[PDB]
Amino acid sequence: RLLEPVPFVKTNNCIKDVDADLFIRSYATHLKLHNKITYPKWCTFVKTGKGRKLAPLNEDWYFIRASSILRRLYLHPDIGVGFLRRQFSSKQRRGVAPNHTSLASGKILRSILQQLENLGYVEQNPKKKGRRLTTKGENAINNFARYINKKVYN
Amino acid sequence: DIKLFKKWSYEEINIADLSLVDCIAVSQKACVYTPHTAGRYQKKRFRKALCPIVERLVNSMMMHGRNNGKKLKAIRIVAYAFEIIHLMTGENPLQVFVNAVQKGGPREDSTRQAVDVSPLRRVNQAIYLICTGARNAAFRNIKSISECLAEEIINCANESSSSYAIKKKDEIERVAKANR
C-alpha cells in the first residue's frame, strides 16, 4: 500500500517520484507552518464549484488546493486560470435532467495563483500564456520530494 | 513459479469431477501473477474453457447494473474475499473457491424431461449462483459484497444448505428428479 519492492531504477528527486496526495498535504502543512499562505477571511465561507454545491469539509482545504495547484504547475509549465478552471472540473447533476461538466470557482484559483506569485513561487512572463515556476519554489519542492523519498526508503 | 497477487501459490490440485479439473484454471498458462489479461473468449465453442477462472469470477462479479464495467473493483472484491476466507480458515482461498465451484455445479437439470449438465456449464452456473447469492446478501444489508462472496464460498465449499448455490442446486436437481 504505502511502499512495495520493485526491480527498476527511479529518478528519486521530483514530483514524478512522489505520492501526489502525501506530497500535497505535506507541502500545504509546511506552507501553513511557515505562514506565508493565508486563507483568507471570505474564503472560509465560499463554495468550490457548482458541480459540488458543497465544499471540502476539512478547514485546511485552501492550503491543500494551493499545494495541488503547485503540483499541476510542476507538471504543466505555462498554464493559466481558464486551464485551472477546466483542470478542477467535474460533472454536475442537472436535477431530473442528465449531467454536464462544471468548473471549479474561479476566484479561489485566481487568489491562489496571485498569492503564490506574491510569495514568489511563480512568475508571469511577457512570453507565452500564464505563470510558470520560480527556481526557489522548484528547489523546495525537490527538497520535500527528497525528504519523503528518504522517509519511505529507510 | 506463478502466484496470485504475488501471494497465493495455487499449484495444488483438487480431485473434482475430472472434467471440472480440465475446465478450471489448473494449467500454468491459465495462471497469472494478478488477475486480468482478457483474451478473446468468444470465438469458438470451447474457447471459454481457456479463460482464467479468476477472470471468469471477476466478470461474474462485474455483472448487474451498477457493477457493469468495474473490473478493477470486481478484482478488489475477490482479493478482499480471499483475505476473509484465509482468516476464517487457514486454507488457500483459491483451493476453497475451486471446492465451492465443484460443489455448486448441478448434476441434472429440468426441461419440457430432465438432462445432464456440461462441466463447463456447471462451472459457469456455479460461479453465477455464488455471485448472484452474494449480491442478494449484499443488497440493503450490513454485509459487504466481499464478505458475502467469502461467506457464500465457505458455505458452498463446506456443503451447507444455507448456501444460496447449494439450495438452488438442490432445488434444481430435486425438481428434475421429481419429473424424471
Binding site: 471570505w42 465561507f45 463554495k47 454545491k53 458543497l54 465544499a55 | -
Partner: protein
Amino acid sequence: QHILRILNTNVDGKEKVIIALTAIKGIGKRMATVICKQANVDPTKRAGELTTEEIDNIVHIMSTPTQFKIPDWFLNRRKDLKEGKNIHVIANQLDSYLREDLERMKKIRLHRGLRHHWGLRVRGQHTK
C-alpha cells in the same frame, strides 16, 4: 443524559450536530455548514452532548445573520419586496409568510396566484 433534545421540541440526539440542525431547516447543508463554522463546533460530534449555550449560539446565528460574515447572496428572504428591507425569515415564519405571499398574489391577481388558487403547477404539468 446522552441523547438530549433540540429546537422547538425535536428529539434528535444521535444525529451529528450538522445532521440534527439540517433536520430543522438548512438541509441544502451549506446553511448548516456555515452555521457550524460560525458556532465553531465540531461537525463530527453527536447532537445530544451539546450544552444549551452551544445550541443557543446556533439559534442566535440562524435567527440573526446580521452580525456574522454572511453575504446577501447567501441569505434566506434576500430583499423582501418593500423599501423596508428584512432578511432571513426562516422556518415556520417563512412558511407563514409564504402563505401570506400566495394570499397577496391571489388578491392582486397574478398568474401564479391564480394557479395556486386553482391548484395548478406554476411550471405546469404539461398535458398529462
